[PDB]
Write a protein that binds this ligand. Structure first.
Ligand code: PC1
Ligand code: PC1
Ligand code: 3PE
Ligand code: 3PE
Ligand code: 3PE
Ligand code: LMT
Ligand code: LMT
Ligand code: MYR
Lengths: 104, 126, 157, 119, 78, 13, 459, 88, 178, 170, 66, 55, 55
């Protein structure tokens, strides 16, 4: 069945107190008492501080502390195809044979 | 149909024959159990809501449990044939098993090294 | 301290007056209280409580130990830390434990058996093996340049 | 395919074993069978950095496709013709492999026929 | 502000699928007393039908429209 | 719009 | 070493001649400065080890252990202040003198050049250790803990004394350098097998070896926090350091004599780590965690490989900082609610957010998160054991799984879940307490940055 | 997030709204204090469905132990207000 | 959650709980509202046909067979409200439910940022301290002679009295704390 | 820089390039912007630093150790002679470790450099790594944590006696 | 953030943006599918013809007569 | 998804492969369409089933 | 899509769905969690206490 008449009374008294406690949780206008340029420019200034300046430091480290030590930056070799010219030497790669052509 | 309980999948209360028993012997037990719970709840809450409490609430049941699982163990131990057999098997059993795994394996590895058929190609760190 | 020897776990209760004193110690009824079997494994008179995980405690009741779903003062199961809600669950399942074990290992056994069938009856296309030039790329695969390979010759069909 | 339901669910002696191809000697049935021709030199494949999987009998068409891609960059859609040429060569190579499978299937048929007459 | 609820008298199950359910129940002597509580889900902006083609083909019309304009460009730039 | 106090532990330390 | 030992001895008059309000500030500050001076031992620009005199030396094995010892003294002092603040002035000074005494004895122990000198200082440490445990421990079980600790050590140490006398009677010296150069192969007699055990047992009990470890969980649960710190961090390492020094003369019997101790350690490390899953006492859990870690040190010293010795040296230092940190973290909650039961205080991340961060890093260190020196030591030990026998990885693999389980279990249980909100005496973290945690964890990170300093003798 | 906070008058309106769409209740004789069993003549099985309709309306569950005591619309309104910390 | 359970459930309570479960699992099977409404009415008819069973022993047997039937026709994955036990948002905000006694450790610089909140908090603390002794006396006075006890607490009978043991209910954290 | 003899690098062979399309290559323009905005200011800072360095030029020297008698020439129990010989052996053992590191560094650099050709074009680096590894194993494998000149010598004599026995049976 | 007002039991009011952006992306999907299928249909339907093995003459395969 | 998944399905059909693996990989691919339809059917189509206060 | 689209439309017909053993397998994830996550932690955690710590 429903609340006994005592249960009804208790819940009423707690309800009055709880709703007063919850009201007290609200902040006043002054609380919290804390002690005291276009767009794209904001995109520009972020770039200088968080791209340009770090890139000066990273480039300095890569150029003068990594590229000056053996095997620290090792690349695979570039692809050389028939008919290319190699800048370091100047040699020209001979062309390929003939197949002869075919049609789908 | 029918549900078969297991130790890790227990019987639901709704399927339990003892939940549908209304004999006054059972109802007296159920009322007695709630009286114990209610008195314990009241004692806890009086401590909990007391505005002069300065420290946490001591929990005698937890102290008993941690005591039962440490200091109370050895005084209540009795050497029996089952204890002794279990102790010897659990204590020494794995030790002997692993001895023969490592001993057998390492004997074979040495046997191959003496007669040259262990391929130590690039192994220089050990 | 607060815990006198009469408030702490003791030895196995040998008399019905010791059973009653033990039940009062653990906040139980004498009819509900029962210790573990006297095996000399260190249980003493600690209550042997039912093996249900805390997953099965009423999740709507306002337990004093909220996460443990225990009330303050009630006896703690010996394996509570095994049965906390982060660990072993013993709660009833919609399908019987035996049926789940049969179906799971039935499914696993069937699939393992029949991967083997697919191994001895593979699927492939009606195509001959791929062919590679230069003695099957003997030099490229690392073969010793000095030693002549065994010639491998491919034809035009 | 049909070839699988014949090797199984039927006799297998007349069906090729996919790993045991070519089982018969290559000259069998071809008088002066010509060796397959390879356009690209070993140096050319090495310099183009072709992977060993890619160094097959169509590598010359792959080499122009790679060459075109590098030159046509950043226009990555400009290599459609060279991609087609390489694909077609690989298609003919695949058919060549289909012919070898069919050749063995027929030779095993002949072996079963001529063995029946012998006994 | 203060949310104002729609007038409750409008939730009528006439013409909705819930009426079909009331016919079936009435055959065996039953009726659903909560049927009007659900009627809002079947009438108003929620009235209609959502066919699977309509969900998939969303945007097909203008996607196909733009397709021929773009195809018109390619048959003219060439 | 009402602003409510948010209970927190002492984070000063 | 005299420029390190003499200032340490001057801490004793400084303690006793200071004013009551200046004692802690004085002794802590100069203890920090003495740690600074011990870094001079790291200036090693060649491969010749430093022999300062006939009596004191320092090489890449003792140098890290000496510096870690010097660093612990200030940290132990900060750890002790809060729970001693009710003792009268003379009792506080007596406690500080016990802590300084261990620092002096241990620095001398790790720099001794002669084995009976090592033995005398090795045994001397028991006196201040026992006094700390029994006079300032909290429970009635501290007296039993004192008995186990003293007599587990002593029964093993008496055979060690006999072996040292026997070696000296035969060789004419116990100087370590000369024993190294003039060592000759042993015959595999029964008498020499007993000699091996007499030389090894005291160090193995001290580690502790699984089977004779029961003294250590007892000693930690009952000791005060500064006792737990020194015991877990440095005192266990006397056994490993002893084993490495003395095993040079025991060849080739260690090849077969080590098998029972490799087996106990490799199996035992699984038994003790699995205990940590079902341990209700937080201090006991951390203590059993140490036994599991020191089992790895035992195994790698027993197989005597360059990798195994290097992995053991790193783990010795890493465990020293990590376990001392965990004891300090556990003691901060105990000082608030005065219980060591792990499951009692819960959800503490809600109220101690920065202390919970220290908890997480200590736990991450403990389960050996890469690239920490904790992981580096355990990794190289695993590689050396796999070489010794490929089946060791099975037991290694099980221990790694279990170590993650209990390490995260401790964090989840104590820091997460709902706050146990009846604990209204959860005062905010002390500046001292948060500083203490940082002084553990910064060196761990700095050593991870420069791991050459703790590689030991073989690399 | 985007939902407005509940209000005592807002809860009351939606609680009576759901009840007005229950064919076993005549809307005219329904007030906040109408007892479901006495004044409105509904059995216990009906009260189970009234709560089940309330849970659907507000999207949260009422435990059986608490639901069995809610016998008038004002009890329902009070319960929802205390669950959701509504106070004005 | 607000009311403590009794020593045992009466036969009526057990039947009404099965009715709520049965409908809710039906809803999970049906999904669609029109289909659910159809079968919800069929379900009520089955509970009605035996509503007036006066045997009791038959009524208890009818409860047994229905519960056995429920377990076999149970939905394996029933719908759960997000904030209910087993729901996806269950205990989601417990890490934000900081108890009020934490404010007793706030620094004066922390308290100075809410001068008005901490003035009201003092009034609530003064109210709590004055009422405690009366609350304890009332519970002592209202203890029954026979040991039979329950978890229900009495209201405040007199005037100016607050109901006993109210602080942990009234001042508890909000459901959505932050 | 470094010694091109110790750390050899093949000469580079970079193609033309020969662009076909008319589109502009974004990498080419980004590199020019990079060489102006980034590379150029960094070089000026470095050149300033190098100018300061030349005004304070100091020098350091690689230390030379004269050979001392080997462990083979030490009387047993002669700790003074054993010590110097043992310290010499530890210095050599350390230098052997770095020679292994150089050979592995060449091997790794060559594999990366050769890419899909590594199985053919790394033959010399792989053979040197194989030879230098054999020689390393003969000196140092199985000495243990207490490795020393005495143990190395005992290991050598054990191998020499076995080689002699095998040759004598031949 | 436009502050849509909540609605009770009625279909809400949709802003133009969420309708147009939702309609644009759906249309973009279908333009791409049609435009690609117009130009690269063989990628879906295949390009090269699959030969029929049985119609290869014995002369092509070098089968000697029995 | 087409530019990777279609090649995967081509590769499995035309390669020497375990036949059970081939089959259940294709069954699981059709099952992918099925549970995608489960989301589309029950989330985007059908009638409202959420609480009446719509925000 | 067609199979799922067909099977989903059958959910609207006024016929009650039952729990066949195949769907329960799917819904309960082949029972792999309901078994492995109960038996395995139980056996290993029991050994830690009963055998390793206590015995
Ligand atoms: C988690 C790791 C398991 C805990 C370690 C353990 O106690 O196993 C010991 C055991 C010792 O052997 P045991 O299984 O015979 O130990 C006794 C077990 N009872 C009491 C159940 C008979 O080793 C194992 O087999 C663990 C695998
Ligand atoms: C943490 C890490 C901090 C990093 C801080 C980097 C600061 C680098 C300082 C170098 C600044 C050099 C600027 C410069 O180029 O001119 C310096 C200037 C030099 O001017 P200059 O660099 O423009 O000279 C041009 C080049 N010459 C000289 C060859 C024509 O220094 C002086 O003040 C004059 C003394 C020379
Ligand atoms: C992360 C790992 C790199 C951090 C260390 C570093 O980059 O600065 C040290 C740098 C080099 O100095 P050093 O170590 O003595 O020897 C040369 C190369 N290691 O010393 C410097 O050159 C300082 C300038 C480097 C600043 C940019 C570093 C970005 C990386
Ligand atoms: C291949 C078989 C896979 C075996 C791996 C172990 C299974 C994983 C067990 C697990 O995850 O436990 C989860 C369990 C409860 O989680 P859950 O079932 O999801 O319930 C949530 C409620 N919805 O929560 C737990 O209880 C986890 C805590 C268990 C801690 C003890 C584990 C000890 C470690 C034993 C070492 C061996 C590792 C086991 C795997 C073997 C590998 C060699
Ligand atoms: C991660 C973020 C990095 C934070 C640390 C940065 C400080 C730093 O500059 O350290 C770099 C330096 C690395 O030098 P290096 O070992 O030679 O590197 C290998 C070859 N480049 O590393 C170092 O040399 C610093 C090494 C730390 C020195 C410790 C300082 C005193 C420690 C107090 C005693 C406590 C420790 C007790 C145990 C010590 C055992 C020796
Ligand atoms: C991993 C480590 C391994 C630990 C050891 C595992 C092996 C354990 C088995 C040991 C077997 C011997 O077990 C033996 O049992 C007898 C049975 O009464 C005990 O005997 C007990 O009762 C007798 C009376 O009869 C007393 O005299 C005795 O002091 C008491 O202990 C012994 O004290 C115990 O030593
Ligand atoms: C080359 C790339 C081409 C990219 C193509 C991009 C085309 C962009 C078209 C944007 C369409 C906006 O136009 C939009 O049309 C739809 C029609 O679906 C209208 O939508 C209306 O009718 C449709 C029927 O189609 C109903 O499903 C919808 O509920 C209704 O609101 C929108 O009210 C209108 O805003
Ligand atoms: C024979 O070629 C073996 C290849 C494997 C076949 C698996 C089944 C693929 C399904 C194709 C759809 C059929 C549409 C007519």
């Amino acid at each position: 069945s429903g609340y006994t008449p005592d249960e009804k009374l208790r819940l009423q008294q707690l309800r009055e107190l709880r709703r007063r406690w919850l009201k007290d949780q609200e902040l006043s206008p002054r609380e919290p008492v804390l002690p005291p340029v276009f767009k794209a420019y904001r995109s520009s200034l972020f770039a200088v501080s968080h791209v340009l300046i770090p890139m000066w430091f990273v480039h300095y480290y890569v150029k003068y502390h990594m590229a000056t030590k053996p095997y620290t930056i090792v690349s695979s070799k570039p692809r050389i195809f028939p008919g290319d010219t190699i800048l370091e030497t100047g040699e020209v790669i001979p062309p390929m044979r003939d197949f002869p052509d075919q049609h789908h | 149909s029918k549900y078969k309980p297991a130790p890790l999948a227990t019987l639901p209360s709704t399927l339990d024959p003892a939940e549908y028993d209304v004999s006054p012997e059972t109802r007296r037990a159920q009322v007695e159990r709630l009286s114990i719970r209610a008195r314990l709840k009241r004692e806890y809450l009086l401590q909990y809501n007391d505005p002069k409490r300065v420290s946490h609430i001591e929990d005698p049941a937890l102290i008993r449990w941690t005591y039962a699982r440490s200091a109370n163990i050895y005084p209540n131990f009795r050497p029996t044939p089952k204890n002794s057999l279990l102790g010897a098997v659990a204590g020494f059993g794995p030790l002997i098993f692993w001895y023969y795994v490592f001993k057998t394996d390492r004997d074979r590895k040495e046997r191959l090294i003496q007669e040259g058929k262990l391929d130590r190609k690039f192994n220089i760190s050990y | 301290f607060h815990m006198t020897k009469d408030m702490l776990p003791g030895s196995y209760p040998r008399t019905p007056e010791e059973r009653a004193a033990a039940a009062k110690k653990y906040n139980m009824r004498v009819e509900d209280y029962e210790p573990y079997p006297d095996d000399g494994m260190g249980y003493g008179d600690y209550p042997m409580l039912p093996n249900r995980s805390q997953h099965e405690r009423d999740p709507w009741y306002q337990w004093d130990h909220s996460e443990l779903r225990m009330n303050w003062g009630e006896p703690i199961h010996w394996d509570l830390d095994m049965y906390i809600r982060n660990r072993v669950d013993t709660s009833p399942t919609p399908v019987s434990w035996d049926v789940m074990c049969k179906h799971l290992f039935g499914f696993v056994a069937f699939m393992v058996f029949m991967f083997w069938v697919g191994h001895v009856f593979p699927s492939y296309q009606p195509v001959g093996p791929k062919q590679y030039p230069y003695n099957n790329l003997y030099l490229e695969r690392g073969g010793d340049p000095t030693k002549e390979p065994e010639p491998v010759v491919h034809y035009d069909i | 395919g049909a070839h699988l339901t014949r090797r199984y669910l039927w006799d297998a002696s007349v069906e090729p074993d996919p790993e045991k191809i070519p089982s018969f000697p290559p000259d069998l049935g071809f008088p002066e069978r010509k060796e397959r021709v390879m356009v690209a030199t070993q140096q050319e494949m090495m310099d183009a950095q072709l992977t060993l999987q890619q160094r097959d009998y169509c590598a010359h068409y792959l080499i122009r496709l790679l060459k075109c891609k590098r030159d046509s960059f950043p226009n990555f859609l400009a290599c459609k013709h060279e991609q087609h040429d390489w694909d077609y060569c690989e298609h003919l190579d695949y058919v060549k492999r289909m012919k070898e499978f069919e050749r063995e299937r027929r030779l095993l048929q002949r072996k079963k026929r001529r063995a029946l007459k012998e006994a | 502000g203060k949310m104002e609820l729609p007038d409750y008298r409008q939730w009528k199950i006439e013409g909705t699928p819930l009426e079909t359910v009331q016919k079936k129940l009435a055959a065996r002597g039953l009726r659903d007393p909560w049927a009007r509580n659900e009627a809002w889900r079947y009438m108003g902006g929620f009235a209609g039908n959502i066919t699977f083609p309509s969900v998939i083909l969303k945007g097909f019309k203008w996607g196909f429209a733009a397709f021929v304009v773009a195809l018109g460009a390619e048959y003219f730039l060439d | 719009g009402k602003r409510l106090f948010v209970v927190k532990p002492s984070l000063y330390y | 070493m005299l420029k390190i030992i003499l200032p340490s001895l001057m801490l004793l008059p400084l303690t006793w001649l200071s004013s009551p309000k200046k004692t802690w500030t004085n002794v802590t500050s100069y203890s920090f400065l003495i740690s600074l001076t011990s870094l001079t031992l790291l200036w090693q620009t060649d491969e010749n080890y430093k022999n300062f005199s006939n009596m004191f030396s320092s090489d890449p094995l003792s140098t890290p252990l000496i510096i870690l010892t010097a660093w612990l003294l200030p940290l132990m002092l900060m750890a002790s202040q809060n729970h001693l603040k009710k003792d009268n002035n003379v009792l506080q000074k007596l406690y500080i003198s016990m802590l300084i005494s261990l620092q002096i004895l241990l620095i001398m122990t790790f720099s001794a050049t002669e084995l009976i000198m090592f033995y005398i200082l090795f045994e001397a440490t028991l006196i201040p250790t026992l006094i700390i445990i029994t006079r300032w421990g909290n429970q009635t079980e501290r007296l039993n803990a004192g008995i186990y600790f003293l007599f587990y050590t002593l029964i093993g140490s008496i055979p060690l004394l006999i072996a040292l006398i026997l070696i000296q009677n035969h060789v004419g010296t116990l100087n370590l350098m000369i024993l190294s150069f003039t060592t000759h192969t042993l015959d595999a007699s029964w008498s020499n097998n007993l000699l091996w055990l007499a030389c090894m047992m005291a160090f193995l009990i001290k580690m502790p070896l699984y089977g004779v470890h029961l003294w250590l969980p007892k000693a930690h649960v009952e000791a005060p926090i500064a006792g737990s710190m020194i015991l877990a961090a440095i005192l266990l390492k006397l056994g490993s350091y002893g084993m490495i020094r003395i095993s040079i003369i025991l060849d080739p019997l260690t090849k077969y004599m080590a098998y029972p101790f490799i087996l106990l350690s490799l199996w035992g490390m699984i038994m003790t780590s699995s205990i940590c899953l079902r341990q209700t006492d937080l201090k006991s859990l951390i203590a059993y965690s140490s036994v599991s870690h020191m089992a790895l040190v035992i195994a790698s010293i027993m197989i005597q490989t360059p990798w195994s010795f290097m992995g053991a040296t790193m783990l010795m230092i890493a465990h020293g900082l990590t376990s001392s940190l965990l004891f300090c973290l556990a003691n901060s909650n105990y000082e608030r609610i005065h219980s060591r039961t792990m499951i009692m205080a819960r959800g503490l991340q809600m109220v101690f957010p920065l202390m919970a961060t220290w908890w997480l890093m200590a736990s991450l260190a403990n389960l050996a998160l890469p690239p920490s020196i904790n992981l580096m030591g355990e990794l190289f030990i695993t590689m050396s054991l796999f070489s010794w026998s490929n089946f060791t990885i099975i037991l290694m693999g099980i221990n790694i799984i279990i170590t993650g389980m209990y390490s995260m279990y401790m964090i989840i249980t104590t820091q997460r879940g709902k706050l146990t909100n009846h604990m209204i005496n959860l005062q905010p973290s002390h500046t001292r307490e948060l500083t203490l945690m940082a002084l553990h964890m910064i060196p761990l990170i700095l050593l991870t940055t420069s791991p050459k300093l703790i590689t030991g003798l073989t690399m | 997030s985007d939902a407005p906070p509940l209000t005592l008058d807002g809860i009351k309106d939606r609680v009576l709204y759901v009840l007005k769409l229950y064919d076993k209740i005549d809307p005219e004789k329904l007030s906040v204090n109408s007892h479901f069993m006495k004044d409105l003549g509904l059995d216990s099985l009906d009260q189970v469905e009234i709560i089940m309709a309330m849970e659907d309306e507000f999207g949260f569950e009422i435990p059986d132990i608490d639901a069995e005591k809610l016998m008038c619309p004002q009890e329902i309104v009070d319960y929802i207000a205390d669950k959701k910390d509504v106070y004005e | 959650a607000f009311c403590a359970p009794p020593a045992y459930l009466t036969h009526q309570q057990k039947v009404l709980r099965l009715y709520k479960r049965a409908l809710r699992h039906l809803e999970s099977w049906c999904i669609h509202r029109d289909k659910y409404r159809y079968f919800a009415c069929l379900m009520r008819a089955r509970f009605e046909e035996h509503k007036n069973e006066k045997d009791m022993m038959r009524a208890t047997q009818l409860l047994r067979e229905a519960e056995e039937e429920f377990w076999q026709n149970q939905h394996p994955q029933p719908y759960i409200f997000p904030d209910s036990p087993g729901g996806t948002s269950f205990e989601r905000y417990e890490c934000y439910k900081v108890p009020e006694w934490c404010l007793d450790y706030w620094h004066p610089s922390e308290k100075a940022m809410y001068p008005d909140y901490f003035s009201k908090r003092e009034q609530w603390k003064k109210l709590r301290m004055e009422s405690w002794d009366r609350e304890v006396k009332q519970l002592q006075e209202e203890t029954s002679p026979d040991g039979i006890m329950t978890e229900a607490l009495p209201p405040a009978r007199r005037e100016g009295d607050l109901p006993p043991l109210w602080w942990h209910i009234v001042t508890r954290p909000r459901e959505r704390p932050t | 820089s470094w010694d091109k003899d110790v750390y050899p690098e093949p000469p580079s062979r970079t193609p033309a390039p020969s662009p076909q399309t008319s589109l502009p290559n974004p990498i080419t323009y980004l590199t020019k912007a990079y060489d102006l905005v980034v590379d150029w200011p960094v070089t000026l800072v470095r050149e300033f630093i190098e100018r300061q360095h030349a005004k304070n030029r100091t020098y350091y020297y690689h230390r030379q150790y004269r050979r001392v008698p080997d462990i083979t020439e030490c009387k047993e129990g002669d700790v003074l002679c054993i010590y110097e010989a043992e310290m010499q052996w530890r210095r050599d053992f350390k230098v052997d470790q770095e020679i292994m590191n150089i050979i592995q560094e060449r091997l790794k650099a060559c594999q990366q450099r050769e890419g899909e050709n590594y199985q053919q074009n790394c033959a010399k680096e792989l053979e040197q790594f194989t030879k230098v590894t054999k020689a390393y194993q003969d000196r140092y494998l199985d000495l243990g944590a207490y490795y020393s000149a005495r143990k190395c010598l005992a290991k050598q004599k054990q191998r020499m006696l076995e080689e002699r026995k095998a040759a004598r049976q031949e | 953030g436009v502050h849509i007002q909540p609605r009770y039991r009625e279909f809400p009011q949709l802003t133009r943006s969420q309708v147009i952006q939702g309609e644009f992306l759906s249309s973009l999907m279908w333009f791409w599918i049609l435009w690609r299928f117009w130009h690269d249909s063989d990628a879906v339907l295949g390009h090269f013809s699959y030969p029929d093995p049985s119609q290869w003459t014995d002369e092509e395969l070098g089968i000697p007569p029995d | 998804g087409f530019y990777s998944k279609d090649l995967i399905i081509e590769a499995i059909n035309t390669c020497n492969t375990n036949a059970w693996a081939l089959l259940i990989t294709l069954i699981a691919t059709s099952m992918t369409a099925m549970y995608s339809m489960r989301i589309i059917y029950f989330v985007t189509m059908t009638k409202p089933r959420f609480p009446p206060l719509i925000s | 899509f067609l199979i799922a689209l067909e099977l989903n439309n059958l959910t609207m017909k006024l016929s009650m769905n039952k729990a066949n053993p195949y769907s329960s397998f799917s819904t309960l994830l082949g029972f792999f969690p309901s078994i492995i996550h109960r038996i395995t932690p139980m056996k290993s955690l029991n050994l830690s206490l009963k055998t390793s710590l206590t015995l």
